[PDB]
Amino acid sequence: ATTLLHCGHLLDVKKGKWLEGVTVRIEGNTIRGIEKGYVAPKAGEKVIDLRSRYVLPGLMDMHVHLESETNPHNTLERFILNPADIAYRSVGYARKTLMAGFTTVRDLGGTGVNISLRNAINAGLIDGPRVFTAGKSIATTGGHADPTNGYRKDLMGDPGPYEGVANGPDECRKAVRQRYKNGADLIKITATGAPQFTDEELRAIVETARDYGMKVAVHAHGAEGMKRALRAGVHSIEHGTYMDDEAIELFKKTGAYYVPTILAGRTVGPQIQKTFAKAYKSGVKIAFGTDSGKSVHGLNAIEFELMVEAGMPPLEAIRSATLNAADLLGVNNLGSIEAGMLADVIAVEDNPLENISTLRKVVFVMKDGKVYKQE
Amino acid sequence: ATTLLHCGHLLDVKKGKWLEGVTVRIEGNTIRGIEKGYVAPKAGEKVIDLRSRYVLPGLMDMHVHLESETNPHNTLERFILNPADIAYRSVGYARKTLMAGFTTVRDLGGTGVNISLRNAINAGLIDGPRVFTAGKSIATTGGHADPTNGYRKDLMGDPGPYEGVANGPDECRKAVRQRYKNGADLIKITATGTAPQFTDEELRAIVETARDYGMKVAVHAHGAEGMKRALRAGVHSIEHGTYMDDEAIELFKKTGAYYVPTILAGRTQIQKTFAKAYKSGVKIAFGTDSGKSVHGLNAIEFELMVEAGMPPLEAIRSATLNAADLLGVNNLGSIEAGMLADVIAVEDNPLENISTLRKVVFVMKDGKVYKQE
Ligand SMILES: [Zn+2]
Structure with a gap:
């Protein structure tokens, strides 16, 4: 299936430069190419209008704990919660993460329910990010x-x-x-x-x-x-x-x-x-990591601000969530919108390089070929 | 050993009457008798001055849980506490209960640490009430x-x-x-x-x-x-x-x-x-289920029984005579010859204002004085 993204600005994180008024051609789950201008659909094709948007690769968070989120009773809940309870909470946690714009996550801790969550998301059973999990x-x-x-x-x-x-x-x-x-x-x-x-x-x-x-x-x-x-x-x-x-x-x-x-x-200092x-x-x-869970899930983008306030330039932070993250994972088809990569695309309203806090309101989310969010 | 109690008022719970200005003579752990007046002590006889005080038999509580006490964290505590931790907490719980004036209690629930606590108190290792426990x-x-x-x-x-x-x-x-x-x-x-x-x-x-x-x-x-x-x-x-x-x-x-x-x-x-x-x-019979309430606040229940319409004398009888009958013992719950010296004393007349039992000024168990304030 063919989907065209009519992007007003598309971020080349390798170059570090915005590309203005381009088209991203996606067939199935893979980015097939980038074409200058907005291209008409020659044959019926799905077109998504992101002309008023800034477009980024799907962000990746290399520290999340999708099984849990902090709660006044986590220590007691360790003794009262069964695997099914953990899974049912993980459902909402994963959905909030994916719609925050983080199409890929590295889960660094669980009871093993995290493996079932990854397999269930990959099977199409539950909406979530691509999870690479350490298990226990x-x-x-x-x-x-x-x-x-x-x-x-x-x-x-x-x-x-x-x-x-x-x-x-x-x-x-x-x-x-x-x-x-x-x-x-x-x-x-x-x-x-x-x-x-x-x-x-x-x-x-x-x-x-x-x-x-x-x-x-x-x-x-x-x-x-x-x-x-x-x-x-x-x-x-x-x-x-x-x-x-x-x-x-x-x-x-x-x-x-x-x-x-x-x-x-x-x-939990400075x-x-x-x-x-x-x-x-x-x-x-x-590489970008929030340790989500101790921090409420879907608020990961806040870390971006904290990295820029510490002196990291916005381009280097976004690269840490994309290029560096994909390198750390050991995967070569994620973290940059270019031919041959997986169609993980997010889009925001304003320029993320001039104000990184715009990343905390992601308006367009597409993971693999499918669009999950289009506010 | 011989001890003389010079009691300004001593409660005869059976006749429900105060006796004024009397001496309670105890030998060892047993009440030997009640004598008229404040009998002058012979050498070797110890005398405790309760002339300004109202004197009653030791109170007994027939629903207590000495292993635990309520706190925001009891539900998480069970997964973390070992038997020894429970014993060390129970030590203080028992001491506070004894100083509230409750010389005998019926512990109606535990993990079995209550049994060891009873055996340790009876062995003289830990200050406490006479404990009758159901274990688990x-x-x-x-x-x-x-x-x-x-x-x-x-x-x-x-x-x-x-x-x-x-x-x-x-x-x-x-x-x-x-x-x-x-x-x-x-x-x-x-x-x-x-x-x-x-x-x-x-x-x-x-x-x-x-x-x-x-x-x-x-x-x-x-x-x-x-x-x-x-x-x-x-x-x-x-x-x-x-x-x-x-x-x-x-x-x-x-x-x-x-x-x-x-x-x-x-x-x-x-x-x-x-x-x-x-x-x-x-x-x-008198019971507070203290444990879910802080130990040592047992006397409050007295108040509530009077507030529900029970006369103060019958509340004190529920804590003494009725309690001793429910336990099945014939030597506790009344100050008279031949019984064990469990004696408490308060400031005001408990029959005219029962809340005086919440300020127990004198506690005696098995002839031993634990409190004389
Ligand atoms: Zn962690």
Whole structure:
């Protein structure tokens, strides 16, 4: 099927330049090309009028938790909520995310319901973003992602690699293989609260993950855990609130991405923005991530503002949500509107490079070939 | 050891009369007698001055839960608290109860830590009231005393007689025997939610087993139908009997079972029902279900019983004579020769203003003085 987007302004994020009065030709789910002017439909074709709009690639958020959203009772709800309850809330969370304009997300934590949500969205059952999920986070015993942490001794039990808790390299191998068996796209670990992973454990995780084509994302606020993860060869660091100048040189030599998460934890202080500034000025690779869930879903665009207020130019923020995100995912057909890519397109009212806050009201959303939002 | 109490006013609860300016002579843990005047002490005899005070027997509360106390977080607390945490909290709960003047209590529900608390208090390890506990309450699956109620299915499991959840007469027999094995003094079951949760055959099995092992049966019941099933089964006490039919009151009088209102906890109606019950001549024993209310505020219930029309003397009798009768002990609840020295003292006449019981100035248990303020 053929859909033509008559775009007044279309953002070339690789060039960094707006293209004025162009047509995007989409056949099926793929962008077939960009044509100057507005092209009449030679044969009956679907045309969408975005001439008064600014057009962007579908934004991607590389830190979301689609299973949960914070609530006065999350800690009790951990004991009272069943998988079906989690799924039914995730429905609305995913819909709000997709209609905020984020066509792709990287889910870094759940009970495994996230895998079912991705499969159900991909099957056409529920409206949502393309989800690349880590499934269950991997932690060491008592680690941040240990599922039975804080339980009464009777309800605590002894979680092992099947549950995502590993101690020692071989157990780590089984835990990564278990996440692969469960259908995870990537691996996420909790490296600090103190470093919760030894160098050999991290090496085991990174090598196993690379064997199965899974990247490694690392949640770490402490400096030593970040430096261990970076030396091990992990692909991304989350938050990293305290960063050693040594961690910045590690970032630069390894090429790992830094996902700031300024939005989440703003709620929980301002250190994180200071850290982000020092990272961006240093030349650290940056990918866009909000940690949605602690922050209400569909308010991810707020993070854009916070990144620009910290000194990141709007083009570089939008590139962090598009080009850098697609590179971090390991996908080559998303994050830029050009021939051969997947038709993930959003559109806003005003110039996002002159005011980034325009991104918090997305008026047009199309994921794959299908249009989900056209206000 | 010998102690003399110089009591300005001492309440003879049996005759309902004050005796003025008397001496209570206690040897060891037992009341040896009441003498005219303030008897002058011989050497080695200790004397406590209650000449400005009103002196009454130790109060007893027949619905308390010493393991827990209410807070915005009880529902999350169960998933996080271990038995030791519960014991350490219970320590303070018991101490505050004893200093409120309640020298004897009937703990009607716990996880079994209540049993260890009773054994520890009786061993002299922890300051506390004389405790008579049901241990773990028995309920049917989904009953109010079901331990895994509301848990996610992964954590809920299938609780059975070992856990206090029984279905059918044989499981009930085993659950009562399990409480006996664990060291409980009495059995407590939850017969209603308002929907009735124990079948007549189940109730008969429970009371007959309890009767074999010398244990009384107390029943938490809010609904009328479960209340009447329990009363027909032959239970000893009905607790929180809200929504009570007039026919149930006739059953009450024929069975002789006690009605424990727990008006204080039901302030969260109960008062209208308690008023009708008291007017009908039902046997009433004092109970607060403190635990859901802060421990140490038990005396407030006294107030409410007088507010519903019960005369102060009968409220004090419900906390003393009626309570001791319901427990099945013959040496507690009245200051007279041959009984155990559980004695409290207050500032004003409790029969003219019962709220004076909320300021207990003197507490004596088993001959020992815990409070003399
Ligand atoms: Zn997170």
